[PDB]
């Protein structure tokens, strides 16, 4: 009942911003560009410092012409409209957004701990208590997002940041979409795609719960449940209905994952009459205090190392590229509402 009350208020706040999005709330020249933190098909994220406050941020720079060539116009509009409207302890905040002749800009909170991806690959795998701590945060984040009729659609260690307190911050809302009922877009990352996506079946929020199963598996195993050298081989494994677990996986863990990695939607945890509660109440989560997690009162598995503000040693190095702004406006109409 307290959960319903909280979510009801959360939706009221979200819908106000959803219907009236913030737009043009800063300018490129207000930020000092320092270093690239990550890259994508049509842009990059750079560590920046806001000159008037001295605050550090992570600024995503999207080349409008590249967005259009990859047919991601509506997805980029989705991303910005959603991210400026949401608010949850484990979601990165969009602080400013604006555009110029050449690029779109999304100025987000900088999360100095780096990607879960980097730590997971380096350490090999997380213990189950460690993986559970992260997993719980995704569970609550998805409960929140789904209550707003949003689907996230790109869960993976590369899209999860670790903050200074050791907590998760979900970023990368590029495929996030607000949809009541059913949607069809083939998108995501091969290892994490639900069978209904690759089979072009038409799908809903249940694909996020499948992806959570993939994520928990990979965190606790050190490798995903479905992997191969070519995506087609990955897809063949995903739809096959077969999954094998490391012998070190607990029996509770295996039970949870068999229910999350359920090819049959009518049997998938997160998608039954009991909704997210079949997950929250699963044996594997019996020690999880969902409220303490939300309030950030639980001791994290580890805190990332930090050496003063603006330090980036928790991020890989990327090739840098000067930002150029054309003297002509590119793709004005397509991105008008940004």
């Amino acid at each position: 009942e307290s959960v319903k009350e909280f979510l009801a208020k959360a939706k009221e706040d979200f819908l106000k911003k959803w219907e009236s999005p913030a737009q043009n709330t800063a300018h490129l020249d207000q930020f000092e560009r320092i270093k690239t933190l990550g890259t994508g098909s049509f842009g990059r994220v750079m560590l920046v410092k806001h000159k008037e406050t001295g605050n550090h941020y992570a600024m995503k720079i999207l080349d409008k012409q590249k967005v259009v060539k990859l047919k991601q116009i509506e997805h980029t509009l989705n991303e910005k409209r959603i991210l400026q409207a949401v608010n949850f302890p484990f979601l990165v905040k969009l602080e400013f957004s604006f555009k110029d002749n050449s690029n779109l800009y999304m100025v987000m909170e900088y999360v100095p701990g780096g990607e879960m991806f980097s730590h997971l690959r380096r350490i090999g795998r997380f213990s189950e208590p460690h993986a559970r701590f992260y997993a719980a945060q995704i569970v609550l984040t998805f409960e929140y997002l789904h209550s707003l009729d949003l689907i996230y659609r790109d869960l993976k260690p590369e899209n999860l940041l670790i903050d200074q307190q050791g907590y998760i911050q979900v970023t990368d809302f590029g495929f996030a979409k607000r949809v009541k009922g059913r949607t069809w877009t083939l998108c995501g990352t091969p290892e994490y795609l639900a069978p209904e996506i690759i089979l072009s079946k038409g799908y809903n929020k249940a694909v996020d719960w499948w992806a959570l199963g993939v994520l928990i598996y990979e965190m606790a195993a050190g490798y995903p449940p479905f992997f191969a050298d070519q995506p087609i081989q990955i897809y063949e494994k995903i739809v096959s209905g077969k999954v094998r677990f490391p012998s070190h996986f607990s029996s509770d863990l295996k039970d949870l994952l068999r229910n999350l990695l359920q090819v049959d939607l009518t049997k998938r945890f997160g998608n039954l009459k009991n909704g997210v509660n079949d997950i929250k109440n699963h044996k594997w989560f019996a020690t999880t205090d969902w409220i303490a997690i939300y309030q950030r009162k639980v001791e994290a598995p580890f805190i990332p190392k930090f050496k003063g503000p603006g330090d980036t040693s928790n991020f890989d190095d990327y090739e840098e590229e000067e930002i150029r702004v054309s003297i002509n406006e590119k793709c004005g109409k397509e991105f008008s509402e940004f």
Partner: peptide
């Protein structure tokens, strides 16, 4: 081992999204 197979695979680096 499954772990050794993973580490020798071409997909232990960052994975690109697909679409379209």
């Amino acid at each position: 081992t499954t772990y050794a197979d993973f580490i020798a695979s071409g997909r232990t680096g960052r994975r690109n999204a697909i679409h379209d």
